[PDB]
Design a protein around this ligand. Structure first.
Ligand code: CDL
Ligand code: PLX
Ligand code: PEE
Ligand code: PEE
Ligand code: 8Q1
Lengths: 62, 178, 459, 220, 128, 88, 67, 175, 104, 124, 111
C-alpha cells in the first residue's frame, strides 16, 4: 500500500521494456547502435588485452 | 449595462465622460498616487475654469478642442480593470455559464440527487407560468399606439404582479458560476 | 468474388420481407457482417492481382475501396433512421433498397475486369443517387441539384463510351490485363489528343476538377445525410480509380497534356481553400474541403510516379472517412436546430462536451495532423510534386496553411464562444450519434497503425 | 541565422522595456533570449546554444512562477502600475525574483553566467557581421533595463493595489516549487559546466576591456 | 495646435473626433429619435418571444435569413456582364493559370535541358 | 482559499468609509440615504470623482450610463450588490 | 496556516517565510563570494594579453628596409 | 547473436577499454548498474528461460520458398501472352530483391555513421563507396520508368543506354 | 464588431448584434475574431512609415556590416596533418600537395 | 580593435587581409624556419574521437584532460592541472597567430614603402 | 544488457500511464493532479541515471525498435537518438515540469 506506486509504474514497465529490447529488438542487426567508446593512450583493451602506448615524449613546457 | 440607453447624449454627459476618460488616462501616465493627485487637481481646476459659459457654441468648441487634445495625448496602453471589456479577465468565466433550461433534460437518476432544489425549481416555474399572461397584458396596456420609443420596461403595479419580462433577468447564471 | 456480391442481393429481399419494426436492425447487422466478410480482400500479393474469374479481379488499389464501401453502408443506415422515423414502411424499405443497390453497383464497379463493364456500373451508380437526392431532400433546391449532378456527369461520360468502343475496335480487347501487357505508346496527333481528352474528362468531372465542380456543392448540400456520406466518401473516388486505371494506355502523351489540369488543380486548390474561409453554410464548407483534397489527388495522379500513386490511394481513403464524419457532425446540429447557418448555434462545447471532442478529432484529421494517414498521403504527394518541380512547394505550402485556418475556424465558430440565448432545444447527444462518430474515427487511427493496407499496388 | 537572431533579440528587448503587463515583459524577455540563442548558433557554436537553453529554462520558469504568485495574491491583477511595495509583504517571492533577475542578467557565478558570458565573449572574438555584434550588445543592455523595471515597479515604493489586502504566499506547494527552481538557478550552471566534456575550443586570450564587455554593458 | 489624426480604412475616425457630431440640427435629433424607436420596437418584439414560457425552439431571425440568402442565392439574378465584371473575371480567373503555367514550364524546360547535358547531380536520387 | 463571501454590510461599510474620507462631505451629516446634489450640495464633477473612488475601492469599473444615475450611498451599495451577486 | 485580510494595513507575515527568504539570499551571496574567491580568473581573464608593438623584428623576421 | 549472418551485416571487433579508477570515491554508476542487474536483468532472464523451455517442447519449421528461373522478356515473342506474364512476374520479383539489396547497404551505412562517432567522415569511406556504387546501378536499372512500369520499358531503357554507349565508344575510337 | 459599444445589452453579447437588425454584408470578416478597424492612437500612414523605415534601415545596416565585417587581429588557424586532409573526407590515394606550418 | 578602424578608414593598402593571408613566403624574411611539430598521432586522435576542430597542435593536452576526466569521474573538480595545461597551450597558439598577423602587417607596410621609394629613386 | 537503452525508454514510457488512466476512477477524483505530479517526479529521478552514465563514459545510443512501414528503397522506423542533447535536455525538462505541476496544484485550485 505504501510503495506500490514504484512497483506498478516503474518496475513493471522496465521489466517489459528490458525484455522487449534484450530478446526481440536486439534479435535483428543494427537495431541498437552505440557509438564506439573513446580510447586513450595508456589504456588496455578488455577483450584482446592489448595495451596502448604512451604519447610521444611531451616537450615538458613546465 | 443595466439601464436602457437614450436617443442621444447631452452636452453635460459628454463633458462628464471626457472628464472621466482624461482622469483615467492621466492616472495611467502618473503611476504614483501623490503625483496623480497633484495633476488630477490641476485637471479639475482646468475643467471647472470654463464651467460658467452661457454661449453653448463656444462650449461645444471648447469640448471639441479638449477631445482633440485628449486623443493626441492619450496613453497608448491605458490601465484597464481585469474584468472590463479590454481586461485580462474580461470573459474568462463565460465558458462556465450554463443556462437554467438545461436542467430540464437531466436524467431522473441525476435529479434523484438534489430533491429540494428541484422542488424549489418547480415552484419558480409555476410562478412564471402563472405570471406570464398578466405581464403580457400589462405591457399591452402601457405601450403607446405607435410602438415603444425606448427600451425601458414598466414595473409591477397591481396586487401580486411581477415586473414584465423578468425571468431571464432574475435567473442569470452567475458571475462566478462554477 | 460472388461471396460478397450475393449476400448484398440477399440483403434486398431480407429488407423487403422483414417486419415493419425490424428493418433497421436486420439491415445494420447483415451489412456489418458483409463488411467483415469483405475484410478478407486485404490479403493481396506483391506481383499481380487476385484474378477470381474472367469477370472480376481484386487489386491492391480496389480492395480498400471495397472495404470502405461495405463499411460505409451500416453507418449510413444508422445516420438515416433518425430523420426517417415519420416515413411509411414502404418508403423506408425503398430508401434501404436504394442504398443496397448503390452498394451493389459500387462493389461491382471496383472489381470489373473490363472497361465497358466498369463504365456500365460506374454509370449505373447514378440512378440510386439521383433518386435519393431528389426524393428525400429537404429543400426545393434538391431538384436543381439533381439536374446538375446528372448532366455534369453524363456530358463527360458519353465521350468516354465512344472512346472505349473505338479502342476495342482498334486493339481487340478492353480487358485490363491484356490492355496492360499489350500497351503501346500514343503518338502526337490531333486524333490522339482528342482520344486522351475523351478518356480523361469523365474522370476529371467526377473528382471534380476545379472549374467543373459546380455540381458538387449543390448535390452535397441538398442531399440527405446518407446521400452526402456516400457522395463524399466513395463516389468521388470513382474518378481517381478510373483515372489510375485508364492512364496505362495514355503514355507518353500525358507528359504534356497534363499541364492545364495540373495548373487548374493547384490554383483551384488555393481558391477552394480560400472559399472555405468565407462560408455561411456549414455543409458547403465541407463540400469545398472535399474539392481541395480531390485537387491534390488529381495532381498526384497526373504526375504519374509511384510515390504520387501511393499518396493518392492513402489520401482517397482518409478523405472518405474524414468527410463522412464531418457531414454526420454537421447533420447532428442541423437536426437539433433545423438550420445550416454556421453562426446560429454557438458555444456548443458547453452544452455537448463529447460531441465537441468528436468535432476536435474530425477537424484535426482534416488538417492532416501527423501521423494520420491524411498526412501520410498529403506528404507523399507533396514529395512527388517537389521532385516534379521545386516550385510546387509554394502552392502546396500555401494550401497547408489555409486548410488549418478554415478547419480551426469551423471548430471555433461552432464549439467555442457563448451559446445563443434563444435556443433552448439542444437535447443531450444520443447513444446512436456517439456510436456513429466512434465508428467513423476509430478505423482511421487503426489504419494509421498499419499504413501499408491503404498505400495501393505501387507499395 | 546570425542576422535574424540579432534583429529579433534587439527588437524584442526594445519592446520589453516599456510594457506594463508583467507577463508581456517576461514573454518579450523569452523572445529576446531565443534571439540570442539564434545568434549563438549563427557563429557556429551550437553546443553553447544548447547549454544556454538548459541554463535559461530554470530561471525563466521561476520568473514566470513568481509573476504568477504576485498575480494570484493581488486578485488576478497583472498590470505593474497597480503593484506596490511587495519587497516586505512578499519576502520569499521577492528573494526568488531578485535571484532570477540577477541570473538572467548573467551575474557572475550564477546559472545565466556560464552560458551568456561565454556567448558574448565568443561573439566578440569571431569574424562576424559588425551590426549583429552591435545589436547583441545593445540587447544585452536592454535585458538588464527591463529586469530593473519589473523590480522597481513591482517590489519597490508604496502600495497601489486595492485596499482589501489578501496577500498570502504561505502555501507549501508554491514555496517548495519555487525553492527547487531557485536551487537550480543558483547551482546548475556550475554543476553542468563542470560535468560536461569539452566540445569547444575556449577563448583563452582576450583584451581586458573586451573580457568585461558584458559586465560593463549590464551595469550601464 | 496638436498634430492631427487622419482616419484610414483599417483605422477609422473616433466618434469624439468627428465634426459631424459637434454641429447638430433638430432634424438630426428627430432622426436619432426614429432610430431609437425602431431599435426599441425590434427589441420588444424579440423579448416578447424570448421570455415566453411555452416557446421551445429557435427564434427565427429574418435578418440572418436575408443575409445568407443575399450572400448565396441572390447574387446571380443580380449579375450583369459589364466591362468591369468581364475584365475582373478574365483577369482573376485567367491570369494566374497562365502565370503559373509559364513559371512551371520554364522551370521544367530548364531542368530537362540540364538533364540532357548530363549535369544535374542526380546522385542518390533513387525515389521519385 | 479566495476572497471571503462579500456581504451587504461589508459593502455599505466600505462605501461609507470612502465617503467619510472625502474632504467635501462632513462625516456626521452624511447618512446612508443622503443625496449628493440636494442634501450634500455637490456638483456633477464631485459625483464623477466619487464614482471613480468607488471603482478603486472595489477593483471594478462602472459604466458611465449606470454611474450617472446613482445619487445616494444606498444606490451605490445596491448596484454593487446586484453586480457581484450578493444576496446576504 | 490561517491569514485573514487586513484592509489597509500591512499583511500578516509568518516567521518561516522571512527565514527562508533571508536564508536563500544569504546562500546566494555566499556562493558568489566563494566562487569569486576561488575562480577569479573566470571573470578577470587568466592569461596576459600581449602587445604587438613590443615585438622585435628579430623574432618577427622582417628585413631592415634594404633588400 | 546468431539470428543474422555477420557477413551480410559486419561489425568491427569492438575494442572497449578497461576501467581505471583514479579516485578514492565510489563510482555511483557501478552501484546503480549492480542494482539494475540484480533487480531487472535476472527476473527477465528467468522469464525468458521459462518461455524458451516451453518453446523447446513444441518445435516446427517454416521453409524459405524457392523459385526457378524462367525465360526473360528478351526470349519472348511480341504477342505471346503467357511467356510475357511469367517474365513480368520474374522481373517484379527481381525488382523487389534489388530494393532489399539497397536497403541492406543503407542499413550498413547508417550503422557505420552512428558507430564511428566523431570520426565518421573518415572511418565510413568504404560503406559510402559501396552505397554510391549500388545507388548508381539501381538508378540506371529502374529510375524514370514511372508508374505503370514493366519489364518491356526496362528493356527499352537498357537498349537506349546501350545504343548511346556504343555510339559514344565508336566516336571516341575515331579520335 | 469591435467598435460596437461593449457596455450595451446586446441580444448576442459575443457577436455584439441585436435580433432583427440589418447585418453587414461582410459580418463574417468583422466578427472581432478577425479584421479589426478600430481607431488607433497613432495615425495610419504614420505607423506604416515608421515600421517600413525600421525594417529598411535594419536591412541596409546588416548589408553594410557584412561588407564591413568585424574580426580579431590574428592569422588563420593551423592544423597539423596537411589541414587534416585524411580527416575531412579521406581520399588516401592522391598524395595531396603538402601544407606546412613553421614556428614563429 | 583599432586595426578595423585603420583598415576601413586609413590606408587599406598596407593593412593585412584576414582571408588572404599570408601573402609573403614563410621563409622570406627568416633565414631558416623550424617546421612546427605535432605530438599526437593521427591514430591516437581518431581513437580519442576529439573533433575535426579540436585536432589542433594542442590536441595532446586535450587527450590527457579527457583521460583524467574519465578516470576521475565522480570527483568532477580534480581535472584542474590538465585543464590549465590545455588552456596554456591554446593561449600560446593564439599568441603565435597574433604574431603571424603582426608579421604580415609590417612586411606589407615595409615592402610597399620600400618599393615605392625605390620607384621614387627611379623617378629622378 | 547495458541498462542505458532500457532506462531511456522507460523514462518516456512511464509518462503515458496517467494518460491511459484518464478513463478510470482516478480521473474523477481529486487525487489526479498529485498522481500526475508524482509520475513526472519519478520519471525525472529515473532519467537521472542515463545522464550519469553519459557523464561518466560519454555513452550514446540509437534505438530503432519498431519498423513502421517500408517504401521501395526507404525504410521508416520508430527510432530514438539518445546522444548528449537528449540525455541532457530530458532531465531538465522533467525537473521544470515537476516544479510547474506542483505550482499549478495551488494556482489552479479553483478551476
Ligand atoms: C501520445 C500519448 C500516448 C498514450 C498511450 C496510450 C494512448 C491510448 C489512446 C487510444 C486512442 C484514443 C481514442 C480516440 C477517441 C477519443 C476518446 C474520447 O472520446 O474521449 C472520452 C474519454 C473520457 O473522458 P471524458 O471525461 O468523458 O472527456 C470527454 C470530454 O470531451 C473532454 O475530453 P478531453 O478534453 O480530455 O479531450 C479528449 C482527448 C482525445 O481526443 C483526441 O483527439 C484523441 C485522438 C488523437 C488525435 C486524432 C487525430 C490526430 C492524428 C494522430 C493519429 C495517432 C493515432 C495512432 C494510432 C492509435 C490507434 C488507436 O483530446 C485531448 O485531450 C487532446 C488531443 C490532442 C492530441 C495531440 C497528440 C498528437 C499526436 C501525438 C503522438 C501520437 C503518436 C504516438 C507515437 C509517436 C512516436 C513515438 O476521454 C479520455 O479518456 C481522454 C482521451 C485520451 C487522450 C489520448 C491522446 C493521445 C493518444 C493519441 C493516439 C494514441 C497513440 C497510442 C500509441 C502509443 C504511443
Ligand atoms: C473550365 C475548365 C474546363 C476543363 C479544362 C480542359 C482543358 C483542355 C485544354 C487542352 C490541352 C491541350 C490541347 C491541345 C494540345 C496543344 C494545344 C496547342 O495550343 O498547342 C500548339 C498547337 O498550335 C496551335 O495552338 C494550334 C491550335 C489553335 C486552335 C485551338 C483553339 C484554342 C483556343 C481556346 C479555346 C478554349 C478551349 C476550351 C473550351 C472550354 C502546339 O503546336 P503544334 O505542334 O502545331 O500542335 C501539336 C499537335 N501536332 C503535333 C499534331 C501538330
Ligand atoms: C508562405 C505563404 C504565406 C505566408 C504568409 C503571408 C500572409 C498570410 C495571410 C493570412 C491571411 C489569413 C486571413 C484570416 C486569418 C484569421 C483572422 C485573423 O487572424 O485576424 C487577425 C488576428 C487577430 O488580430 P490580433 O492582433 O491578435 O487582435 C486580437 C485582439 N483583438 O491575428 C492574426 O492572427 C493575424 C496573423 C496574420 C499574420 C500574417 C503576416 C505574417 C507574414 C510573415 C512574413 C515574414 C516571414 C518570416 C521570414 C523569416 C526569415 C527567413
Ligand atoms: C501491453 C503489455 C504487454 C506485455 C507483454 C509484452 C512483452 C513483449 C512483447 C513482445 C512482442 C513481440 C514484438 O513486438 O516483436 C516485434 C513486433 C513485430 O516486429 P515489426 O517491427 O512490427 O515488423 C515490421 C512490421 N511493421 O513489433 C510489435 O508488434 C510491437 C510494436 C510496438 C511499438 C511500440 C509502440 C509504438 C507505436 C505507436 C504508434 C505510432 C504511429 C506510427 C508512428 C510512426 C513512427 C515513424
Ligand atoms: C493624459 C492626457 C489626457 C488629458 C487631456 C484632456 C484636457 C481637457 C481639459 C479642458 C476641457 C474643459 O474643461 S471644457 C468645459 C466646457 N464648459 C461647459 O460645458 C459650460 C457649461 N457647463 C455644463 O454644461 C456643466 O455644468 C458641466 C461643466 C459639464 C458640469 O456639469 P455638473 O456640474 O452639472 O455635474
Amino acid at each position: 500500500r505504501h510503495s506500490i506506486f514504484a512497483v506498478t509504474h516503474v518496475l513493471i514497465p522496465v521489466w517489459i521494456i528490458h525484455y522487449y529490447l534484450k530478446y526481440h529488438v536486439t534479435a535483428k542487426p543494427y537495431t541498437v547502435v552505440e557509438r564506439k567508446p573513446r580510447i586513450f593512450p595508456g589504456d588496455t583493451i578488455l577483450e584482446t588485452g592489448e595495451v596502448i602506448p604512451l604519447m610521444k615524449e611531451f616537450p615538458d613546457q613546465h | 449595462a443595466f439601464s436602457a440607453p437614450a436617443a442621444y447624449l447631452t452636452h453635460q454627459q459628454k463633458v462628464l465622460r471626457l472628464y472621466k476618460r482624461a482622469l483615467r488616462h492621466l492616472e495611467s501616465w502618473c503611476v504614483h498616487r501623490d503625483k496623480y493627485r497633484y495633476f488630477a487637481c490641476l485637471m479639475r481646476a482646468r475643467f471647472d475654469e470654463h464651467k460658467n459659459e452661457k454661449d453653448m457654441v463656444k462650449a461645444t468648441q471648447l469640448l471639441r478642442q479638449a477631445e482633440e487634445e485628449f486623443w493626441y495625448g492619450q496613453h497608448p496602453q491605458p490601465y484597464i480593470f481585469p474584468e472590463s471589456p479590454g481586461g485580462t479577465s474580461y470573459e474568462r468565466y463565460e465558458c462556465y455559464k450554463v443556462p437554467e433550461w438545461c436542467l430540464d433534460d437531466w436524467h431522473p437518476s441525476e435529479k434523484a440527487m438534489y430533491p429540494d432544489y428541484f422542488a424549489k425549481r418547480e415552484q419558480w416555474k409555476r410562478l412564471r407560468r402563472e405570471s406570464w399572461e398578466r405581464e403580457v397584458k400589462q405591457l399591452q396596456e402601457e405601450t403607446p399606439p405607435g410602438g415603444p420609443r425606448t427600451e425601458a420596461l414598466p414595473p409591477a403595479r397591481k396586487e401580486g404582479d411581477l415586473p414584465p419580462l423578468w425571468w431571464h433577468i432574475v435567473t442569470r447564471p452567475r458571475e462566478r458560476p462554477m | 468474388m460472388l461471396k460478397i456480391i450475393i449476400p448484398t442481393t440477399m440483403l434486398l429481399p431480407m429488407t423487403w420481407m422483414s417486419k415493419h419494426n425490424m428493418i433497421w436492425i436486420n439491415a445494420t447487422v447483415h451489412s456489418l457482417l458483409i463488411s467483415l466478410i469483405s475484410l478478407s480482400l486485404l490479403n493481396q500479393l506483391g506481383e499481380n492481382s487476385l484474378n477470381f474469374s474472367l469477370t472480376f479481379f481484386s487489386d491492391s488499389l480496389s480492395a480498400p475501396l471495397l472495404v470502405l464501401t461495405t463499411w460505409l453502408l451500416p453507418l449510413m443506415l444508422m445516420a438515416s433512421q433518425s430523420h426517417l422515423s415519420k416515413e411509411t414502411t414502404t418508403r423506408k424499405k425503398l430508401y434501404i433498397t436504394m442504398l443496397i443497390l448503390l452498394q451493389l453497383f459500387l462493389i461491382m464497379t471496383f472489381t470489373a475486369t473490363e472497361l465497358i463493364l466498369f463504365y456500365i456500373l460506374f454509370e449505373a451508380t447514378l440512378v440510386p443517387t439521383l433518386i435519393i437526392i431528389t426524393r428525400w431532400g429537404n429543400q426545393t433546391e434538391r431538384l436543381n441539384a439533381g439536374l446538375y449532378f446528372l448532366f455534369y456527369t453524363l456530358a463527360g461520360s458519353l465521350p468516354l463510351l465512344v472512346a472505349l468502343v473505338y479502342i476495342q475496335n482498334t486493339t481487340g480487347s478492353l480487358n485490363f490485363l491484356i490492355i496492360h501487357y499489350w500497351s503501346h505508346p500514343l503518338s502526337n496527333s490531333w486524333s490522339n489528343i482528342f482520344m486522351w481528352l475523351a478518356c480523361i474528362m469523365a474522370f476529371m468531372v467526377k473528382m471534380p476538377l476545379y472549374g467543373l465542380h459546380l455540381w458538387l456543392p449543390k448535390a452535397h448540400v441538398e442531399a440527405p445525410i446518407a446521400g452526402s456520406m456516400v457522395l463524399a466518401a466513395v463516389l468521388l473516388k470513382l474518378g481517381g480509380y478510373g483515372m489510375m486505371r485508364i492512364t496505362t494506355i495514355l503514355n507518353p502523351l500525358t507528359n504534356y497534356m497534363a499541364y492545364p489540369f495540373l495548373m487548374l488543380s493547384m490554383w483551384g486548390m488555393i481558391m477552394t481553400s480560400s472559399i472555405c474561409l468565407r462560408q455561411t453554410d456549414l455543409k458547403s464548407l465541407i463540400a469545398y474541403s472535399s474539392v481541395s483534397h480531390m485537387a491534390l489527388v488529381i495532381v498526384a495522379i497526373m504526375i504519374q510516379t509511384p510515390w504520387s500513386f501511393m499518396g493518392a490511394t492513402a489520401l482517397m481513403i482518409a478523405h472518405g472517412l474524414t468527410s463522412s464524419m464531418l457531414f454526420c457532425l454537421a447533420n447532428t446540429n442541423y437536426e437539433r436546430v433545423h438550420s445550416r447557418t454556421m453562426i446560429l448555434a454557438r458555444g456548443l462545447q458547453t452544452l455537448l462536451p463529447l460531441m465537441a471532442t468528436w468535432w476536435l478529432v474530425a477537424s484535426l484529421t482534416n488538417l492532416a495532423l501527423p501521423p494520420s494517414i491524411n498526412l501520410i498521403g498529403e506528404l507523399f504527394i507533396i514529395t512527388a510534386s517537389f521532385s516534379w518541380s521545386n516550385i510546387t512547394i509554394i502552392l502546396m505550402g500555401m494550401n497547408m496553411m489555409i486548410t488549418a485556418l478554415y478547419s480551426l475556424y469551423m471548430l471555433i465558430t461552432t464549439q467555442r464562444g457563448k451559446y445563443t440565448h434563444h435556443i433552448n432545444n439542444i437535447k443531450p447527444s444520443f447513444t446512436r450519434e456517439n456510436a456513429l462518430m466512434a465508428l467513423h474515427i476509430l478505423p482511421l487511427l487503426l489504419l494509421t497503425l498499419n499504413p501499408k493496407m491503404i498505400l495501393g499496388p505501387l507499395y | 541565422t546570425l542576422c535574424l537572431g540579432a534583429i529579433t533579440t534587439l527588437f524584442t528587448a526594445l519592446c520589453a522595456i516599456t510594457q506594463n503587463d508583467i507577463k508581456k515583459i517576461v514573454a518579450f524577455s523569452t523572445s529576446s533570449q531565443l534571439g540570442l540563442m539564434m545568434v549563438t548558433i549563427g557563429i557556429n557554436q551550437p553546443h553553447l546554444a544548447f547549454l544556454h537553453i538548459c541554463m535559461h529554462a530554470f530561471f525563466k520558469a521561476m520568473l514566470f512562477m513568481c509573476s504568477g504568485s504576485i498575480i494570484h495574491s493581488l486578485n488576478d491583477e497583472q498590470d505593474i502600475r497597480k503593484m506596490g511595495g511587495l519587497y516586505k509583504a512578499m519576502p520569499f517571492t521577492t528573494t526568488a525574483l531578485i535571484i532570477g533577475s540577477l541570473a538572467l542578467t548573467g551575474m557572475p557565478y550564477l546559472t545565466g553566467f556560464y552560458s551568456k558570458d561565454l556567448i558574448i565573449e565568443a561573439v566578440n572574438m569571431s569574424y562576424t557581421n559588425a551590426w549583429a555584434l552591435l545589436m547583441t550588445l545593445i540587447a544585452t543592455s536592454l535585458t538588464a533595463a527591463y529586469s530593473t523595471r519589473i523590480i522597481f515597479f513591482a517590489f519597490l515604493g508604496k502600495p497601489r493595489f486595492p485596499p482589501l489586502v489578501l496577500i498570502n504566499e504561505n502555501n507549501p506547494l508554491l514555496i517548495n516549487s519555487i525553492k527547487r527552481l531557485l536551487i537550480g538557478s543558483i547551482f546548475a550552471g556550475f554543476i553542468i559546466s563542470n560535468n560536461i566534456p569539452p566540445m569547444t575550443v575556449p577563448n583563452t586570450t582576450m583584451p581586458l576591456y573586451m573580457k568585461m564587455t558584458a559586465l560593463i554593458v549590464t551595469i550601464m | 495646435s496638436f498634430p492631427k489624426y487622419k482616419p484610414s480604412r483599417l483605422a477609422t475616425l473616433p466618434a469624439t473626433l468627428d465634426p459631424a457630431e459637434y454641429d447638430i440640427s433638430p432634424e438630426t435629433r428627430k432622426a436619432q429619435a426614429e432610430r431609437l424607436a425602431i431599435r426599441s420596437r425590434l427589441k420588444r418584439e424579440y423579448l416578447l418571444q424570448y421570455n415566453d414560457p411555452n416557446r421551445l425552439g429557435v427564434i427565427e431571425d429574418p435578418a440572418l435569413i436575408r443575409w445568407t440568402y443575399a450572400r448565396s442565392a441572390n447574387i446571380y439574378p443580380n449579375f450583369r456582364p459589364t466591362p468591369k465584371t468581364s475584365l475582373l473575371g478574365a483577369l482573376f480567373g485567367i491570369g494566374p493559370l497562365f502565370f503559373w503555367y509559364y513559371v512551371f514550364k520554364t522551370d521544367r524546360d530548364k531542368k530537362e535541358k540540364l538533364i540532357q547535358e548530363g549535369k544535374l547531380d542526380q546522385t542518390f536520387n533513387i525515389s521519385y | 482559499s479566495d476572497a471571503p463571501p462579500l456581504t451587504l454590510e461589508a459593502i455599505k461599510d466600505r462605501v461609507l468609509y470612502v465617503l467619510k474620507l472625502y474632504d467635501k462631505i462632513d462625516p456626521e451629516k452624511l447618512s446612508v440615504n443622503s443625496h449628493f446634489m440636494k442634501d450634500l450640495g455637490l456638483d456633477s464633477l464631485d459625483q464623477v470623482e466619487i464614482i471613480m473612488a468607488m471603482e478603486d475601492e472595489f477593483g471594478f469599473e462602472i459604466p458611465d450610463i449606470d454611474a450617472e444615475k446613482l445619487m445616494c450611498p444606498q444606490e451605490i451599495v445596491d448596484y454593487i450588490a446586484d453586480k457581484k451577486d450578493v444576496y446576504e | 496556516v490561517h491569514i485573514e485580510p487586513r484592509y489597509r494595513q500591512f499583511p500578516q507575515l509568518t516567521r518561516s517565510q522571512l527565514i527562508q527568504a533571508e536564508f536563500f539570499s544569504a546562500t546566494m551571496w555566499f556562493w558568489i563570494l566563494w566562487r569569486f574567491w576561488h575562480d577569479s580568473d573566470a571573470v578577470l581573464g587568466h592569461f596576459p594579453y600581449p602587445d604587438p608593438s613590443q615585438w622585435t623584428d628579430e623574432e618577427l623576421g622582417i628585413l631592415p628596409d634594404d633588400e | 547473436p546468431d539470428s543474422w549472418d555477420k557477413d551480410v551485416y559486419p561489425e568491427p571487433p569492438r575494442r572497449t577499454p578497461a576501467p581505471a579508477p583514479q579516485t578514492s570515491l565510489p563510482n555511483p554508476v557501478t552501484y546503480l548498474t549492480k542494482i539494475f542487474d540484480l533487480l531487472v536483468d535476472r527476473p527477465v532472464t528467468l522469464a525468458r528461460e521459462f518461455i524458451e523451455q516451453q518453446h523447446a517442447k513444441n518445435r516446427y519449421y517454416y521453409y524459405h520458398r524457392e523459385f526457378r528461373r524462367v525465360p526473360d522478356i528478351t526470349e519472348c515473342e511480341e504477342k505471346d501472352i503467357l511467356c510475357m506474364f511469367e517474365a513480368e512476374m520474374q522481373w517484379r520479383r527481381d525488382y523487389k530483391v534489388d530494393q532489399e539489396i539497397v536497403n541492406i547497404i543503407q542499413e550498413r551505412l547508417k550503422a557505420c555513421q552512428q558507430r564511428e562517432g566523431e570520426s565518421y567522415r573518415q572511418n565510413c569511406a568504404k560503406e559510402l563507396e559501396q552505397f554510391t556504387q549500388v545507388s548508381k546501378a539501381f538508378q540506371d536499372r529502374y529510375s524514370d520508368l514511372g508508374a505503370h512500369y514493366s519489364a518491356r520499358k526496362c528493356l527499352a531503357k537498357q537498349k537506349q543506354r546501350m545504343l548511346a554507349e556504343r555510339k559514344a565508344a565508336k566516336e571516341a575510337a575515331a579520335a | 464588431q469591435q467598435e460596437r459599444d461593449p457596455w450595451y445589452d446586446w441580444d448576442h453579447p459575443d457577436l455584439r448584434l441585436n435580433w432583427g437588425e440589418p447585418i453587414h454584408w461582410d459580418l463574417d470578416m468583422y466578427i472581432r475574431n478577425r479584421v479589426d478597424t478600430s481607431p488607433t492612437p497613432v495615425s495610419w500612414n504614420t505607423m506604416c512609415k515608421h515600421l517600413f523605415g525600421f525594417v529598411a534601415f535594419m536591412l541596409f545596416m546588416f548589408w553594410v556590416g557584412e561588407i564591413y565585417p568585424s574580426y580579431q587581429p590574428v592569422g588563420p588557424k593551423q592544423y597539423p596533418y596537411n589541414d587534416l586532409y585524411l580527416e575531412r573526407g579521406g581520399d588516401p590515394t592522391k598524395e595531396p600537395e603538402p601544407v606546412v606550418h613553421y614556428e614563429i | 580593435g583599432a586595426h578595423l578602424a585603420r583598415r576601413y578608414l586609413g590606408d587599406a593598402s598596407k593593412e593585412p587581409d584576414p582571408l588572404r593571408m599570408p601573402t609573403f613566403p614563410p621563409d622570406y624574411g627568416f633565414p631558416e624556419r623550424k617546421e612546427r611539430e605535432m605530438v599526437a598521432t593521427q591514430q591516437e586522435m581518431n581513437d580519442a574521437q576529439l573533433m575535426l576542430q579540436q585536432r589542433d597542435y594542442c590536441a595532446h593536452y586535450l587527450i590527457q584532460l579527457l583521460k583524467c576526466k574519465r578516470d576521475s569521474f565522480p570527483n568532477f573538480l580534480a581535472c584542474k592541472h590538465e585543464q590549465h595545461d590545455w588552456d596554456y597551450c591554446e593561449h600560446l597558439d593564439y599568441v603565435k597567430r597574433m604574431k603571424e598577423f603582426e608579421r604580415e602587417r609590417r612586411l606589407l607596410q615595409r615592402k610597399k614603402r620600400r618599393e615605392q621609394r625605390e620607384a621614387e629613386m627611379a623617378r629622378g | 544488457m547495458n541498462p542505458f537503452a532500457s532506462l531511456t525508454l522507460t523514462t518516456l514510457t512511464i509518462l503515458t500511464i496517467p494518460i491511459m488512466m484518464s478513463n478510470s476512477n482516478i480521473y474523477k477524483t481529486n487525487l489526479y493532479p498529485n498522481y500526475v505530479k508524482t509520475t513526472v517526479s519519478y520519471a525525472f529521478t529515473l532519467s537521472l541515471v542515463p545522464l550519469l552514465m553519459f557523464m561518466h563514459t560519454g555513452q550514446e545510443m540509437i534505438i530503432s525498435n519498431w519498423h513502421w512501414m517500408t517504401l521501395q528503397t526507404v525504410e521508416l522506423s520508430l527510432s530514438f537518438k539518445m546522444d548528449y542533447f537528449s540525455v541532457m535536455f530530458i532531465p531538465v525538462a522533467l525537473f521544470v515540469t515537476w516544479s510547474i505541476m506542483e505550482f499549478s496544484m495551488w494556482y489552479m485550485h479553483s478551476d
